[PDB]
Design a protein around this ligand. Sequence first.
Ligand SMILES: CCOC(=O)c1cc(=O)[nH]c(=O)n1[C@@H]1O[C@H](COP(=O)(O)O)[C@@H](O)[C@H]1O
Ligand SMILES: CCOC(=O)c1cc(=O)[nH]c(=O)n1[C@@H]1O[C@H](COP(=O)(O)O)[C@@H](O)[C@H]1O
Lengths: 215, 215
Amino acid sequence: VMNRLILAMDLMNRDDALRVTGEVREYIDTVKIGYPLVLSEGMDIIAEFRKRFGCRIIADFKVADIPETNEKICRATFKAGADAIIVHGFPGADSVRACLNVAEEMGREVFLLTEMSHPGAEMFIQGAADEIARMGVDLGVKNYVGPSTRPERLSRLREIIGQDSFLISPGVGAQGGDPGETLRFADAIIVGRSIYLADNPAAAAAGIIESIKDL
Amino acid sequence: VMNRLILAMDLMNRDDALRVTGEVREYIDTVKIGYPLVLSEGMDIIAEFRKRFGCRIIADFKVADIPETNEKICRATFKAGADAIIVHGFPGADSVRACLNVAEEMGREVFLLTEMSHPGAEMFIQGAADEIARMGVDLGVKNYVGPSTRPERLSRLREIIGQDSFLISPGVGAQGGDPGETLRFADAIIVGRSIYLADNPAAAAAGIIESIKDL
Ligand SMILES: CCOC(=O)c1cc(=O)[nH]c(=O)n1[C@@H]1O[C@H](COP(=O)(O)O)[C@@H](O)[C@H]1O
Ligand SMILES: CCOC(=O)c1cc(=O)[nH]c(=O)n1[C@@H]1O[C@H](COP(=O)(O)O)[C@@H](O)[C@H]1O
């Protein structure tokens, strides 16, 4: 991804979301869009962003249902133009396989969320996360998400998935993660509030990129 | 809920969804709407259903993000008119608390999903599910979801949450669960495909209700 930086666009107003994304477009090639924006403005926002900005769109929908419903969610998401979807691994292998099947059908990608970045992730997810990652490997998953807030976990995840797999990482900035440390293990970082709540989002993105180039 | 039966409306077309829901409305007072329908037709479908049918709407969004994003998802969902939202417990207590805070702010309800109904739930969720339920109790959660496909698990969940908590249960019909057995432990059953894919959905719903009355 351009500059190894993915914008997490979680503003809930189309005008604000379009303004900020346009301001930082010179510094990214990929926007993560999630439910805060889609549930506020509609699924048509994905194709609008894709067109206006010529970016790739990752739909961060944290898909976490039974296989049959997962199929439906993935199909709707790819029909709306998303390039990839983020899927939880905690519901197990059949749930993940259902997403992979739709992605194969529609020429798209699945990212497997293995261990989350917030404090509550320690309660249940962390203890399963190595297994969730190994499940991903055994299903043929090539794209993963793991936590900037715990780079030792992010190192262990990289160890399981190998060097060829693509790994993106949220929790940089607001949640306490560091760009440079996270990029020791992840291929790209996801950044939301540190950019989209900044007085000058372009300057915030530029500042991050400057520190990335320095790596 | 009327007749202890909740319709899982996962058709992806507004016309089909409206037709089936209207056909079975005499037999339910509550419709579960999830992402298959919302991502296909928009969040406005919730208020449309609420108005047309005068039902309660449970938004089955399986909320499973970090606390700050969970807040945003819940706020958007309640603004759209949903009476309650289904939340995953696997992301831990802060993620669940964020949903409870918004529900308290907006006079709504959270349902905690504790153990899922599909085969993959055995891999990671089942081993954490008793703890997830006890976490719910300790957070003050009063509404829960657990699996029709495993009534011995559904008995254990009821045991943890007590008799005053409200427990609803999917997996009846298509996934192999039985109405009567499930209602030994759950207060209401969720039924999707056995009704909405039936040649005569009203007759399917009526058949289920007849077996429920017999209990
Ligand atoms: C299931 C959500 O998927 C994610 O991308 C995600 C996983 C995770 O463990 N942590 C995490 O923060 N995210 C998402 O990544 C974004 C982080 O934004 P921010 O903290 O504002 O920089 C936000 O959209 C959040 O929902
Ligand atoms: C996270 C989804 O929340 C649920 O209600 C759910 C949890 C679960 O463990 N199992 C389960 O089947 N469900 C949902 O309940 C519905 C079951 O529909 P059906 O199998 O067609 O009768 C469907 O919407 C499914 O997504």
